[PDB]
Structure formats: structure tokens, C-alpha cells
Design a protein around this ligand. Structure first.
Ligand SMILES: Cc1cccc(N(C)C(=O)[C@@H]2[C@H](O)CCN2c2nc(C)cc(C(F)(F)F)c2C#N)c1
Ligand SMILES: Nc1nc2c(ncn2[C@H]2CC[C@@H](COP(=O)(O)OP(=O)(O)OP(=O)(O)O)O2)c(=O)[nH]1
Ligand SMILES: [Mg+2]
Length: 639
DNA sequence: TTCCAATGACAGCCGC
DNA sequence: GCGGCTGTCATTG
């Protein structure tokens, strides 16, 4: 039967609860947030509307222990239990002793870790288990889990507990979601019971699939590193952004006025229909699609397609990068600067990490605008700055996916190239554009990068032709030459497709499985798509495993040499200059840290050493470190 | 429908 | 009319 024990209603019940809690090796917690220093709970950073009023603990059955964090105002509070006394006993039960294996189960661990630190001044110090991450680990292509989907799949007999609790079908924790008519006490108590029991079932399934070691040693520690990143945020300068915006907007104005004179009338740059009417009906250019690929061919024949492409590039930087950054910026009064607080997203097909609100991974590379034949550099990344005195440190793996592919295919030709061979992208660009390596621009090297990974991951002659600007036949010859020169790779492609067809899945270097039932499909497209996913998932997923291990191992090292706070949040939630390195961004094969001037040499050594040691392959994991006053102005730094 | 992975703005359409 | 859905366009790795 569902029972909620209000432990703070009676001194005697409270101590019995505290004694039992202190001996538990496993329990769930769920935070109780409701809509409105206050007597009735702890304000949440970023929401003037909602309070943490308590939390619920579960360690078996359908008993929730509700632990109130209200000074005044379920039976009422025993007044001998001061809030200060409760906060003591709370911090005591949520922090590890020496040689004590202790696991806390939290739905949306990251959001809960942050609220406990910033709102209640409590830093969790135990092993963490998030059922959302366990779901992902069992099927990475599953829809993002909700409490409702977890209970549906893993605890279906308890679905009645969720009847009339419609917010259980949203992504946000039932306890944290104060946009309900149900009390935080009831919501957190139900969640605590559903999550504890759900996690027992998820742990049995992880053990059956042999993913429990991955879950405890890589994925949950990776979530802890991402919690520190989300507490840290990334520094942002508005002055740099505005000055770039003004140059961009001037170019957009000139492009529009010239486009409209060539067209003969106004047209919307955002309507494919309008652009198609102008290009194909009203100018009779040869084709109706208005894609990048189409306009890229046609720019050789008339100026308007090129103007369209530049309009979309610059409009993208203004409306999808500047507008959201200058809206999501937040004053940090301790560091004395604006920062952006993006949200990590780990539920991906291959185990990459991405970001939302906003997605800082998508901030444009440097690009050039010409006006009156004078070039202006647009560096959106230059707006992302360290705290005063600090530096940005970036460490990137050199061709990690190629090194992993070499290791798994034992391809002797690819190993030679990686051992000595110059930049492969520059080599391809040179051969293609009839030049020696040195002339390649950034844009052209990116085109060659797309060609090289494209071919490796099963790009066809029609598409390679559009990209290289050559006939399908010439592209098909290029594909054959690749396959002939690197026969190891081609054997590994056929051996991976054969093994996928048999098993219904592929596995990464750490044992994670992706299910590709399209592999058996009779439809030629769906079959070929699955075969391409099979090959790409093993290499891209393996790379994502290595970067996670690197991230986790760097964080351990930083915290040993840590005579200082493990995140900027740990100073906010505390209430003496900044020392150490702060994880600020992940870019798939690249880690960014914000580092105090004094510590950049030591942090650069730790980061490089730990990234190069993450795993042992047939080939060396090469790491380049760069350093600078912004993400946009990073310079090579020999470590 | 023929590189893979990702987020997100933005016209435009359709059952409610 | 209105929110959901669905391409389509962009960008990054
Ligand atoms: C101009 C052009 C276009 C398209 C293809 C190729 N071919 C068949 C290659 O061989 C090219 C260059 O001749 C040497 C690098 N290179 C590589 N290409 C691929 C696809 C792949 C690789 C790699 F996997 F080995 F890295 C290399 C290299 N090295 C060439
Ligand atoms: N399938 C595919 N994977 C890509 C593509 N671009 C990048 N990736 C994957 C493979 C490389 C990895 C990291 O991308 P980078 O741009 O850093 O590539 P890199 O090979 O490391 O180049 P660089 O030397 O500039 O760091 O992401 C692409 O167009 N297709
Ligand atoms: Mg790289």
C-alpha cells in the first residue's frame, strides 16, 4: 500500500529514520518543488516562481519517507527539528564515508544535482544511478524516456500510481514539475517509489546485457562531468557579437538590394517557392528544388544563386546564433561577466553528447564577408571568452574516427598514412583542384573532409559527383580506387554488415549495442541505410566512448590537484582568486576547459596525457592542445 | 528516399 | 481560426 511517512513530524520518528537511512547502501531520492530567505522552502536559481519544499526517500516496497525542508507550515513540523538541524542530517546522509559503497537513484540526476547544490547548498557525494540513462543504454534509438514511459516498460503493474498525473508524460522530473495541481510531497513520494523499483528492473536488464560496468564506470560519471559543465556555463561577450552583427546586417542589406534589382521585384529569401519562381520560371536557369547543391551549381551561370546562399549563411549567424546567445546570456555576479548555461543531451543514436537552449556546438566556424572588395572576418566563436585572467584550453583528437577504423580493420595502408602522411584532407583537395597542399582555404579543406568521411561511410557516385563537381562515372572510379587501395577497410565493412544481419545489432569498443532491424529489410534503401549506420555506429560510437572516458579521467585528476572548487556553481552554492580548470564545452572529438592563468601548463599536461591514455589501440591517439583569450582566437600550444 | 550524427528556425498544411 | 506535424533550410562535428 502507498504510505508517506512524514519523518520531521516527530523527533523520535526522525532519529529512527536517520539511523536507518545512514546504514542503507541503496535508495532513491526525489526533490519536491512547488509554485509559491523564506520560511516555506528554498528558491531555485532561474525560477522566481518555484521552491524546493522537501524531498522523498525510498529504499524498498511502496514506503516513501518525506523529508520536509520548510521552516514553518501531512502532520506539522516538530519544532525541536530546526531547518539547520534537518540540513545537517540531510548533508550527512547524502555524503560518502570512507570504504562505503552507496548508490542513490535519481530520475534526471543532472537537474537534481544542480538544484541540491544551488538551492540547498548540498553536494551529493555517492555513486549515482539515473533510470533515464539506463533506458538509453538498453536502446539508444528509443524515444527520450519520461517517468510514464519508464513505468510503462519496466514497472507496468504500478501505472495506476501515475493516474491523473499527466506531467509524468513530460521529460521533467515529477517532483521538479511544479506546473501540477498535486503537492510536491505527493509527487516526490510517488516518484521516489516508482524510480527505486524501476531501477531494480533496469539494473537486472543491464546485467543481462552486460552493460552494468559501462553504466557505473563511464555513463553515470560522464553525467557528473556534464553537471559540472552545466553549473560552469561558458563566458560570453555582447560587445564582440554586436559589432559582428552590424557588419553582417550591412552585407544583408546590400545583398537584398542587388538580389531585388536582378530579380526585377521584391521576393522572400525564406520562400523556396518565390526563389524557384525567380530562378527557373522568370530567368530560365537549368534545373523544382532550391537546395544548397542546386544553387552551388547555378552560381557559375548568374550572380543571384550566390547572393541567395550568402543571404542564408549570414541570416543563419544573426537569427540562429547571435539572437539566441544574446537572449540566453545571464549575469554571473561572482565572476563579474555574462555567461550562457546550455543543457547537455546524452540521449543520441551513437553516444555523442549534444546541447540545447542554445546548441553552442552549431556556432559557425570563422567566415569572410566582402564589401566594396574589403574582407571582414566574422568570428562568432570570438564572443566566447574565459573569466578575467583565465584562458580557453581546447584539446582535440587527431582523426580519432580514422584511428579507430585503422585499429578495427588492421588496414596497413591507413596505418602508414596516419604514421607519417601529411593532412589527408589537404592531399585530397590538392589532387582534386590540380594544386600542391599549401593553397587550400578553410572552406575547401572542409569540402575535402566531407568527401573523405562521405566515401568511407558509404556515399554513392551520384552524391560524390555533385560534391566534387564531376560526372557520376568519374565519382564511381574514385570510389573503386579508395576500395582498391584500402582493402582492410572494405573487408571490415562486409564483415560488419554480415555480423549485423545475423545479430540484429552492432557493438562499440565498450560493448554498447545499437539495434538496426532495417538490416534485414527487403527495400533496397532501408537495407543500405542500415548497413551504413552499422559501419558508422561502430566507429563514431567508439570515438564517443573514448572521449567520455577521457572526460571522466581528466575530472578525477583535476579534483586531486584541487585545492579549490570543482565548479563555478560550488562557489554560488557555497554562500580568493579562481584556480584550476572548468569543463565548459564538448565538441565530439574536442574538450574545452576555462583555466586560471597559473594553472594552464599543468591542466594542458593532464588533459593531453589523459586523452592519449584513454584506451590502448593498434595506433597512438594523437592530441593537439590550443589556448587563447577566446574560442575564436585559439593558438597551438606545445605540451 | 542512397555518408552518419546532432539542434533548430520557418513556411505551410490539416484534423480539431 | 489553432496546435501538431512535416518537410526544408541552415549550421556544427
Ligand atoms: C582526389 C580524391 C578524391 C576522392 C578520393 C580519392 N582517393 C581515392 C584517395 O585515395 C585520396 C587521395 O588520393 C589521397 C588521400 N585519399 C584518401 N581518400 C579517401 C576517400 C580515404 C582516405 C583514407 F581513408 F585513407 F584516409 C584517403 C587517404 N589517405 C582522391
Ligand atoms: N560521416 C561524417 N562524419 C563527420 C563529418 N565531419 C566530421 N565527422 C566526424 C568524423 C570526424 C569527427 C571530428 O570532426 P573534425 O571536423 O574535427 O574532423 P577531423 O577529421 O578531426 O579534422 P580536423 O583535423 O580539422 O580536426 O566528426 C562528415 O561530414 N561526415
Ligand atoms: Mg578533429
Amino acid at each position: 500500500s502507498l504510505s508517506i511517512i512524514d519523518v520531521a513530524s516527530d523527533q523520535n520518528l526522525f532519529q529512527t529514520f536517520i539511523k536507518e537511512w545512514r546504514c542503507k547502501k541503496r535508495f532513491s531520492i526525489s526533490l519536491a518543488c512547488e509554485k509559491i530567505i523564506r520560511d516555506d522552502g528554498f528558491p531555485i536559481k532561474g525560477c522566481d516562481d518555484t521552491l524546493v519544499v522537501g524531498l522523498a526517500v525510498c529504499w524498498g516496497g511502496r514506503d516513501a519517507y518525506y523529508f520536509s525542508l520548510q521552516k514553518e507550515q501531512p502532520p506539522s513540523l516538530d519544532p525541536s527539528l530546526t531547518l539547520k538541524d534537518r540540513m545537517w542530517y540531510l548533508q550527512s546522509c547524502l555524503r560518502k564515508e570512507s570504504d562505503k559503497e552507496c548508490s542513490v537513484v535519481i530520475y534526471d540526476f543532472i537537474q537534481s544535482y544542480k538544484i541540491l547544490l544551488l538551492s540547498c547548498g548540498i553536494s551529493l557525494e555517492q555513486s549515482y544511478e539515473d533510470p533515464k540513462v539506463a533506458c538509453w543504454l538498453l536502446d539508444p534509438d528509443s524515444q527520450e524516456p519520461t517517468l510514464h514511459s519508464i513505468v510503462t516498460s519496466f514497472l507496468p503493474h504500478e501505472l495506476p500510481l501515475l493516474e491523473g498525473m499527466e506531467t509524468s508524460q513530460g521529460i521533467q522530473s515529477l517532483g521538479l514539475n511544479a506546473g501540477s495541481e498535486h503537492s510536491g510531497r505527493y509527487r516526490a513520494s510517488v516518484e521516489s517509489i516508482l524510480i527505486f523499483n524501476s531501477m531494480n528492473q533496469l539494473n537486472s536488464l543491464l546485467q543481462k546485457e552486460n552493460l552494468q560496468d559501462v553504466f557505473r564506470k563511464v555513463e553515470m560519471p560522464s553525467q557528473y562531468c556534464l553537471a559540472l559543465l552545466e553549473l560552469n556555463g561558458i563566458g560570453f561577450s555582447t560587445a564582440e557579437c554586436e559589432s559582428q552583427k552590424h557588419i553582417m546586417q550591412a552585407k544583408l542589406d546590400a545583398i537584398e538590394t542587388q538580389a531585388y534589382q536582378l530579380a526585377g521585384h521584391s521576393f522572400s529569401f525564406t520562400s523556396s517557392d518565390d526563389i524557384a519562381e525567380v530562378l527557373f520560371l522568370e530567368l530560365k536557369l537549368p534545373p523544382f528544388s532550391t537546395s544548397k547543391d542546386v544553387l552551388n551549381k547555378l552560381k557559375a551561370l548568374h550572380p543571384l544563386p550566390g547572393l541567395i546562399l550568402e543571404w542564408r549563411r549570414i541570416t543563419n549567424a544573426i537569427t540562429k546564433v547571435v539572437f539566441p546567445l544574446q537572449r540566453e546570456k545571464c549575469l554571473n555576479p561572482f565572476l563579474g561577466m555574462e555567461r550562457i548555461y546550455p543543457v547537455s543531451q546524452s540521449h543520441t543514436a551513437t553516444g555523442r553528447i549534444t546541447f540545447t537552449e542554445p546548441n553552442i556546438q552549431n556556432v559557425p566556424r570563422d567566415f569572410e564577408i566582402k564589401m566594396g572588395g574589403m574582407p571582414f572576418s566574422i568570428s562568432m566563436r570570438h564572443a566566447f571568452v574565459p573569466f578575467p585572467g583565465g584562458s580557453i584550453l581546447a584539446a582535440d583528437y587527431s582523426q580519432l574516427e580514422l584511428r579507430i577504423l585503422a585499429h578495427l580493420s588492421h588496414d596497413r595502408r591507413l596505418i602508414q598514412v596516419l604514421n607519417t602522411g601529411a593532412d589527408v584532407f589537404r592531399s585530397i583537395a590538392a589532387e582534386w583542384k590540380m594544386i600542391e597542399p599549401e593553397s587550400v582555404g578553410d572552406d575547401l579543406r572542409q569540402q575535402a573532409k566531407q568527401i573523405c568521411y562521405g566515401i568511407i561511410y558509404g556515399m554513392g557516385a551520384k552524391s560524390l559527383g555533385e560534391q566534387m563537381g564531376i560526372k557520376e562515372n568519374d565519382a564511381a572510379c574514385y570510389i573503386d580506387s579508395f576500395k582498391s587501395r584500402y582493402t582492410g577497410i572494405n573487408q571490415f565493412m562486409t564483415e560488419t554488415v554480415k555480423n549485423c544481419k545475423r545479430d540484429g545489432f552492432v557493438q562499440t569498443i565498450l560493448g554498447r549495442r545499437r539495434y538496426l532491424p532495417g538490416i534485414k529489410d527487403n527495400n533496397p534503401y532501408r537495407k543500405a541505410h542500415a548497413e551504413r549506420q552499422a559501419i558508422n555506429t561502430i566507429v563514431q560510437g567508439s570515438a564517443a566512448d573514448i572521449v567520455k572516458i577521457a572526460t571522466v579521467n581528466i575530472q578525477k585528476q583535476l579534483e586531486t590537484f584541487h585545492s579549490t572548487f570543482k565548479s563555478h556553481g560550488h562557489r554560488e552554492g557555497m554562500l580568493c582568486p579562481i584556480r584550476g580548470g572548468f569543463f565548459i564545452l564538448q565538441l565530439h572529438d574536442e574538450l574545452l576547459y576555462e583555466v586560471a592563468e597559473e594553472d594552464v601548463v599543468q591542466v594542458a599536461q593532464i588533459v593531453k596525457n589523459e586523452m592519449e591514455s584513454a584506451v590502448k589501440l593498434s595506433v597512438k591517439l594523437k592530441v593537439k592542445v590550443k589556448i587563447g583569450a577566446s574560442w575564436g582566437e585559439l593558438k597551438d600550444f606545445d605540451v
